[PDB]
Amino acid sequence: QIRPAFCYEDPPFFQKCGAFVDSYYFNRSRITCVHFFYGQCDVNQNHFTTMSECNRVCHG
């Protein structure tokens, strides 16, 4: 329970529902957050505008 359950969801890689922008998701294998391109498909909440935010909310 240390990090929210959405932290463990796959971000929508390669899916386009609009413009692609820099984003950050928690990678449950590295156990840290990682850059990716988010294309506005709000499939879950595992996407953050900044690395620190992602690391704050999901790192633990």
Partner: protein, 410 residues
């Protein structure tokens, strides 16, 4: 007054159509455009090959066997030749002696040095090499270490050597190599490890010079006892970066052009350092080289896991430029009965040896034209405006003049 109701009733509908078109533009859509491009020239690709056998038997020393014997299943965890010996007579004798460690004192050992010294030598394997009529030599192959060990890249286009070129379709305008895979030099297989194989031959990868090989994963096989023809077709894939697409141009880490393979080799390296505190000797970076015990206990399993089983550690961003080579393979036999004696005499081997060890490999392009497949921006500014002003004339009768008129009026 019914008109002013109707005029702004058509204006409302115009506003809706227009916002739709604006919302669409801000999706930054793309379409894909296929094209065949005739060419007078093609850059010949890089060609990387590896012997399937990683270590020459005649090059493994007592010290090598002491540090790496267990890794190679030549020794058990007690530093002894296992009684599960599936060996002939002479080789067992050589290995028994080599494995005699009584009053032996271990000297320093390093897997990179061991691959470099014990791995097959291009100078022995390359019986002949031609490219477009011109004779080539071991000097034309650059050493590259891979998971298979010590491997060789033709036409690497590195160290300021220019990239070679093809100007016609067909075999005469590509590469032909004859190789001796040297089965008498193969390490006896007494168990199963990531460093041993049941197979005899070579693995090959045809790839752009801007991408490193990943030959254990993406190569193709070539067998001894055949001449193999590989007829190639170049295909160029172009993607858009954001906001239209999600392709990655460059990486500002270990490699300075971005490709899927560069990405995967980065991940693998980070993963080994993170989980084993060492890198395998073919990986880039600063970390120490794994010892043979580390290969066996940590590095081989970790890499096997990461490749085969992990689903999230590495997910690589698509590159903006991808060159791919469609390939059609076919084979004929070597040697014929009529040529075996000639080849045996020329290379000082028996006919049986030639039959088990010699192969010829021809890599060439079918035709010069390459196919391109490209993501294009589907609705740019020019297209948005001219569409808005076209909808004006449809809803109001408005015009570039009609609009300039309402600045004269106001």
């Amino acid at each position: 007054v019914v008109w002013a109701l109707c005029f702004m009733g058509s204006l409302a509908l115009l506003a809706l159509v227009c916002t739709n078109r604006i919302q669409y533009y801000f999706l930054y859509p793309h379409v894909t455009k296929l094209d065949e491009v005739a060419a007078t020239r093609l850059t010949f690709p890089a060609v990387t090959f590896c012997n399937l056998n990683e270590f020459r038997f005649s090059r493994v020393t007592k010290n090598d066997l002491y540090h790496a014997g267990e890794l190679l299943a030549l020794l058990n965890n007690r530093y002894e030749i296992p009684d599960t010996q599936t060996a002939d007579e002479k080789q067992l004798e050589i290995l028994q002696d080599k494995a005699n460690f009584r009053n032996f004192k271990p000297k320093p050992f390093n897997m990179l040095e061991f691959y470099d010294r014990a791995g097959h030598d291009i100078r022995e394997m390359l019986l002949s090499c031609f490219f477009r009529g011109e004779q080539c030599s071991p000097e034309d192959f650059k050493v590259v270490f891979t998971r298979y060990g010590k491997c060789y890249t033709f036409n690497a286009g590195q160290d300021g050597k220019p990239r070679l070129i093809t100007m016609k379709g067909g075999t005469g305008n590509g590469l032909e190599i004859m190789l001796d895979i040297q089965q008498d030099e193969y390490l006896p297989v007494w168990g199963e490890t990531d460093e041993t194989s049941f197979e005899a031959g070579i693995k090959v990868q045809i790839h752009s010079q801007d991408e490193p090989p990943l030959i254990d994963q993406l190569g193709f096989g070539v067998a001894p006892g055949f001449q193999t023809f590989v007829s190639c077709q170049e295909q160029r894939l172009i993607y858009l970066p954001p906001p239209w697409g999600d392709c990655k141009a460059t990486t500002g880490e270990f490699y300075d052009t971005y490709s899927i393979t560069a990405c995967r080799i980065d991940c693998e390296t980070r993963y080994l350092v993170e989980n084993c505190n060492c890198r395998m000797v073919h990986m880039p970076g600063d970390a120490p080289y794994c010892t043979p015990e580390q290969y066996k206990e940590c590095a081989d399993p970790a890499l096997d896991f990461l490749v085969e089983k992990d689903n999230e550690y590495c997910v690589c961003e698509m590159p903006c430029n991808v060159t791919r080579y469609g390939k059609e393979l076919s084979m004929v036999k070597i040697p014929s009965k009529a040529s075996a004696k000639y080849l045996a005499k020329k290379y000082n081997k028996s006919e049986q040896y030639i039959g088990e060890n010699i192969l010829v490999l021809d890599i060439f392009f079918e035709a010069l034209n390459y196919e391109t497949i490209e993501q294009k921006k589907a609705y740019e500014v020019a297209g948005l405006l001219g569409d808005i002003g076209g909808q004006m004339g449809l809803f109001i009768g408005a015009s570039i003049l009609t609009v300039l008129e309402l600045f004269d009026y106001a």
